[PDB]
């Protein structure tokens, strides 16, 4: 009995952690028509209904979202998909040429003085012998002066030439799902107060994550998830001043953006099978596009956020909000996309308040841009064709990104400013409750039994 | 009908019990291994990886002379130099992960002994059958 011999088992439930390539999965509903869109191509296998969830008990596991994989992976995938979609479209090389430009005095309000320019130039036709004279309109933030007479040139001409966007394509995001192949498992921590790093006792396993909607924004987050208990704050090392802070809300807030102006369209021929789209004529009075939010909602939400934040820097402290410090036009202002357009809104009127110890609507203006270089790359620009008719969309605000400014001694006061700029954090705000593990079926143990001859 | 529900036995979730109870429920896991332009290339890599992983385990089980079963005995004698404790505690209060981290260092030798043991067994049996 005391003496014993080794024994072998198979299919033992033990696992470790590693990394591997994931794959996609899309709802069949999207497969129903809608053949034109940057994402949501048909290669994704159709999903399956009635997902199942298995509960575990007596387990405890450590999570660390800061040093997490499968973030850069989907970042790279998104960039590659964008580049692939953009490939087959006409080029825009011949437009680099001197222009003759003037103002536009058509009952413009005083705030728009010099914000539209009427320009004309020469351009070759299909037959290489002839040339023709054409004209168009432009915004101030796309043309530059060089040196009486008046002349102007494009802004990207000396840097690079880039492709005009194809006409029929859709930028609307849709839900997507991530799934792992056989021989791997995906674990989720269901604790409703887990602060993003450390132990977690309540765990479960799944095969495919819930829906995800890729969105591009800065200084805010739109159409995210909603917490369940209260506003939560997350960070790597809150004591350090060089790391951003993510704030996730408990309830949503509503926002309305609109461009009341009206536009038409026109087409021009450049060469064999080469078309070009240009702005037409305006019909009536013109006004600046703008956005609205409520007042009381914002007030109470800020109050709750301050109250929650107070639990780290002592109750005897002062808080002051300040606008963006300053810099280039891409981080200093909140940029977003709605209906195939790009706005740039000045958020000076939202972080202007102070807090000490113990039906009106806020309206803000925006501006329009037509040449874009996103993902902070160089040598790759785009052209956005104009659209006809007014536009208006509505969305939800769900999260904020803040950065604490430096201080001196204990001045019983602190300041925060909006930050951001890197799109990694936007992905990181979602995939902080998922881990990937690998199985190890073999096993060995001693046993009193002995093999028979 | 009105109160009757459904209670199935799922994937790996018994990993919170003693060292012994878990072994009663193993078969299920064994039946879940071979389940079956840049946006679609990686699937081929995944499939190749999966099949290679399965084949490696099949071969390794084949060599040790225990293929076709889930519980197999052998002849190599255990040595207390590798580990301590008695049968009671081991099979009453422990978890598989704890054992894994316990025996991590001394694995290659334990693997190695089995094939030479099997080779001696086979060689002796061959002459036992061939002597007549």
């Amino acid at each position: 009995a005391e003496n014993l011999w080794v024994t072998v088992y198979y299919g033992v439930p033990v696992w470790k952690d590693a990394e591997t390539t994931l794959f996609c999965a899309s709802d069949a509903k999207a497969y129903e028509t809608e053949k034109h869109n940057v994402w949501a191509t048909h290669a994704c296998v159709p999903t399956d209904p009635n997902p199942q969830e298995i509960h575990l008990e007596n387990v405890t596991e450590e999570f660390n979202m800061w040093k997490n994989n499968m973030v850069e992976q989907m970042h790279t995938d998104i960039i590659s998909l964008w580049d692939q979609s953009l490939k087959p479209c006409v080029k825009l090389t011949p437009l680099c040429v001197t222009l003759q430009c003037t103002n536009v005095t058509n009952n413009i309000t005083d705030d728009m003085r010099g914000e539209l320019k009427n320009c004309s130039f020469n351009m070759t036709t299909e037959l290489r012998d002839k040339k023709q004279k054409v004209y168009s309109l432009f915004y101030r933030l796309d043309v530059v002066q060089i040196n009486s007479n008046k002349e102007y040139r494009l802004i990207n001409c000396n840097t690079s030439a880039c492709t005009q966007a194809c006409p029929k394509v859709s930028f609307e995001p849709i839900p997507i799902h991530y799934c792992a192949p056989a021989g791997f498992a995906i674990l989720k921590c269901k604790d409703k107060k887990f602060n993003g790093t450390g132990p977690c006792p309540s765990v479960s396993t799944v095969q495919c994550t819930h829906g995800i909607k890729p969105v591009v924004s800065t200084q805010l987050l739109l159409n995210g998830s909603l917490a369940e208990e209260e506003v939560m704050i997350r960070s790597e090392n809150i004591t350090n001043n060089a790391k951003n802070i993510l704030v996730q809300f408990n309830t949503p807030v509503q926002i309305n953006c609109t461009r009341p102006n009206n536009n038409t369209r026109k087409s021009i021929r450049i060469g064999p099978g080469q078309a070009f789209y240009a702005t037409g004529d305006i019909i009536g009075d013109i006004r600046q596009a703008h956005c609205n939010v409520s007042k009381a909602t914002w007030n109470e939400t800020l109050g709750k956020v301050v109250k929650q934040l107070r639990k780290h820097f002592g109750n005897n402290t002062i808080i002051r909000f300040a606008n963006s410090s300053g810099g280039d036009l891409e981080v200093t202002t909140h940029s977003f996309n709605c209906g195939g357009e790009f706005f740039y809104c000045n958020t000076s009127g939202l972080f202007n308040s102070t807090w000490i110890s113990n039906n009106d609507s806020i309206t803000l203006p925006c501006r329009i841009k037509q040449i874009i270089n996103m993902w902070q790359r160089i040598g790759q620009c785009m052209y956005a064709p104009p659209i006809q008719g007014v536009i208006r969309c509505v969305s939800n605000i769900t999260g904020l990104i803040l950065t604490r400014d430096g201080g001196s001694t204990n001045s019983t006061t602190e300041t925060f400013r909006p930050g951001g700029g890197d799109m990694r954090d936007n992905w990181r705000s979602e995939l902080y409750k998922y881990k990937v593990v690998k199985i190890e079926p073999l096993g060995v143990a001693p046993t009193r039994c002995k093999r028979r001859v | 009908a009105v109160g009757i529900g459904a209670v199935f036995l799922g994937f790996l979730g018994a990993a919170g019990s003693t060292m012994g109870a878990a072994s009663m429920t193993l078969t299920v896991q064994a039946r879940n291994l071979l389940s079956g332009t840049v946006w679609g290339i990686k699937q081929l890599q995944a499939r190749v990886l999966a099949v290679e992983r399965y084949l490696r385990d099949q071969q390794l089980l084949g060599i040790w002379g225990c293929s076709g079963k889930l519980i197999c005995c052998t002849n190599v004698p255990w040595n207390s130099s590798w580990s301590n404790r008695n049968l009671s505690e081991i099979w009453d209060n422990m978890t598989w992960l704890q054992w894994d981290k316990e025996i991590s260092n001394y694995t290659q030798i334990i693997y190695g002994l089995l094939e030479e043991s099997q080779n001696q067994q086979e060689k002796n049996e061959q002459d036992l059958l061939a002597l007549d």
Partner: antibody
Amino acid sequence: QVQVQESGPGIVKPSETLSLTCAASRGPFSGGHFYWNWFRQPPGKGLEWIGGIYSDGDAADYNPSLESRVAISRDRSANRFSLKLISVTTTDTAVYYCSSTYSWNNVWFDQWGQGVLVTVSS
Amino acid sequence: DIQLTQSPSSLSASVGDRVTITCRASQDINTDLSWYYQKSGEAPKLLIYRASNLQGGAPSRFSGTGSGTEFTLTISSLQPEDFITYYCQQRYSFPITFGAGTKVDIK
């Protein structure tokens, strides 16, 4: 092999509110849809039904007898559930049991309980 | 709703005899019923699942048959521990009705 237990106060007085709680363990099975039922045994009869509830949702289904007084809630934190009764009266003289049911492969075990005296009198 | 009748409603069956218990529903319930057995000092338990089907693990001493609104359980011999109350319960649309309770006494 699930073990289910109940508790409660002494002899409550009529015109007051009674409360009770029950705890059950998932035990051997991993994932399922365990169902819970509440019952009482008044003297001189058989059993009387006091409703039931699933283990996955707080929604409670009551019984025809006293629907304006019953209040059943599910405690997700500890896998528990509470049963409360307003306008208590001496008519509630009984021994209360807390039962649960699986659906294990067409066997349908049950672990009715042990009982607890919940009589009412001033 | 649905009402049932159990016979013998009050029988003091002498120990060591074959004993039969009949339960008849009011309206047809197809085949949806179960039988339970209970005694004081403990809680109720199940003796027959599905009625027509025999409960898994129940003693072979008890057997059951029936259909519709007529079912009958036969016990090959009355043990000392079998002097208990039996209930036929319909597993059909709401509400849920239980057996009247046929206590088996000693004589």
